[PDB]
């Protein structure tokens, strides 16, 4: 217990293993320690550490935060096998500055601490406004087809899709910087929506099973094709491919033959259940020498975050459609929802990533809450709403309490 | 001897250890000094710490 071995980082990156005195105060070691790292760098043939003007030498954690100069190395939470960094921190002493006349003083200070609008942000805002605009136009065009059978909806939407896509295509070839690419990506992201309803609107007669199949098909193809050719925005495109593909299969079955929705809903739940287990493997297969490691790591992380999210959307939509307050053995889907919630709650903590673990944890809470709301709006009564409210408020309160206590 | 003698006047326990080995001077990183060479041959000057 008299000494601890730790790695010390020095100038430009040399890590050196050292056996330090565990109880002397850290300020006693930084001077001779600087001499030692310099001696080794000199023999290695490298350039030694040097001061610049006014400042001091300190020993810090890898995070840069300095250790308290008067405390012992054992007094701080430093253990054998950890690492530290020796660093130069410059002098902050300078004159103070004063402006008395109030109007000038407000203008001066307020301009140094905040950011003004610029031409770069103006274009990103413009792109965002047009994307929002076209989804509103397709919405009203779709709302017309859902009550009318004329060619108008497909003819009108097709030209919009082609025009937006033509602009995005021309922008992608010319983009030079990430600022330019974000503008183009927003434009491209919006092109998928009109083409989807444009195709689904083509088959005549009343809307339903046969029309739905085309939309989810072209949606799945377009999202996948955009990803393949662009190689950016993995998350948003991947999530669409999952929900699109799974919906296409269900739509095809219902169009051909299906005894009940419960059958399809149960099938989807089962498909997602196995997919949650296979999720990391799917991501691993879907995903000068050092670069090869860095690129692959974030790629897999991207695909996995979207995958886990898309499955969440399917099960919440499916489970809320499976449970009911009046049909048959009312308790059966409720306990099934409970078991489903427990699995997601337990398995969500195994993933070593904040957004993946957080997104999975949140997915369970919304499923539970949706069932409670269903059991309050339908089968309505004063006791029922009172009971649901108590359950609905205490459930998340208890979840927080388990972590806070 | 003088270090142990001084420690007792301060009320501190003298240097003591168990096992096969020996006592010697070391640098802040634990590296022992050379046993057969002068402190003038080594890089030791007034105000250094050991």
């Amino acid at each position: 217990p008299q000494a601890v071995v730790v790695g010390v980082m020095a100038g430009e990156g040399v890590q050196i293993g050292v056996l330090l005195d565990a109880n002397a105060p850290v300020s006693v070691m930084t001077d001779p320690l600087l001499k030692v790292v310099n001696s080794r760098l000199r023999e290695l043939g490298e350039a030694p550490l040097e001061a610049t003007g006014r400042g001091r030498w300190a020993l810090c954690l890898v995070d840069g935060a300095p250790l308290r100069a008067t405390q012992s190395l054992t007094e701080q939470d430093v253990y054998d096998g950890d690492r530290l960094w020796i660093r130069f921190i410059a002098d902050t002493e300078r004159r103070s500055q004063v402006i008395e006349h109030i109007s000038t003083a407000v203008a001066s200070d307020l301009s140094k601490r905040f950011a003004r609008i610029d031409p770069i942000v103006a274009v990103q805002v413009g792109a965002s406004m047009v994307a929002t605009g076209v989804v509103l136009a397709t919405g009203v065009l779709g709302w017309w087809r859902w009550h009318h059978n004329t060619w108008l909806t497909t003819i009108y939407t097709a030209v919009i899709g082609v025009l937006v896509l033509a602009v995005a295509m021309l922008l992608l070839m010319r983009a030079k910087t990430d600022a330019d690419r974000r503008v183009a990506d927003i434009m491209l992201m919006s092109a998928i929506m009109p083409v989807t309803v444009a195709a689904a609107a083509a088959p005549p007669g009343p809307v339903g099973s046969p029309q739905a199949v085309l939309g989810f098909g072209v949606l799945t193809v377009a999202a996948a094709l955009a990803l393949r050719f662009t190689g950016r925005r993995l998350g948003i495109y991947t999530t669409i491919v999952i929900i699109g593909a799974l919906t296409m299969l269900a739509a095809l079955a219902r169009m051909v033959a299906a005894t009940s929705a419960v059958t399809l809903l149960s099938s989807l739940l089962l498909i997602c259940v196995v997919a949650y287990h296979a999720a990391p493997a799917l991501s691993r297969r879907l995903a000068s020498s050092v670069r090869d490691v860095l690129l692959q790591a974030e790629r897999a992380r991207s695909f996995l975050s979207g995958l886990l999210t898309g499955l969440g959307v399917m099960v919440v939509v499916c489970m809320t459609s499976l449970c009911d307050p009046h049909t048959g053995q009312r308790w059966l889907p409720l306990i099934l929802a409970g078991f489903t919630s427990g699995f997601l709650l337990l398995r969500g903590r195994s993933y070593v990533d904040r957004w993946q673990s957080i997104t999975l944890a949140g997915t369970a809470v919304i499923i539970a809450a949706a069932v409670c709301v269903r059991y309050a709006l339908e089968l309505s009564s004063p006791l029922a709403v009172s009971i649901v409210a108590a359950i609905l408020v205490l459930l998340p309160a208890a979840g927080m309490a388990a972590a806070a206590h | 001897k003088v270090v142990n003698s001084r420690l007792r006047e301060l009320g501190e326990a003298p240097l003591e250890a168990t096992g096969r080995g020996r006592w010697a001077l070391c640098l802040v990183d634990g590296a022992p000094l050379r046993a057969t060479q002068s402190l003038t041959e080594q890089d030791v000057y007034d105000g250094d710490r050991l």
């Binding site: 300020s27 001077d31 008067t70 | 000057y45 007034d46 105000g47 250094d48 710490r49």
Partner: peptide, 18 residues
């Protein structure tokens, strides 16, 4: 400055001569 800081500076200065 503390006694420790003073001795720390004093030891550093004790290393040099004309």
């Amino acid at each position: 400055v503390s006694i420790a800081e003073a001795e720390e500076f004093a030891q550093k200065l004790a290393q040099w001569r004309l």
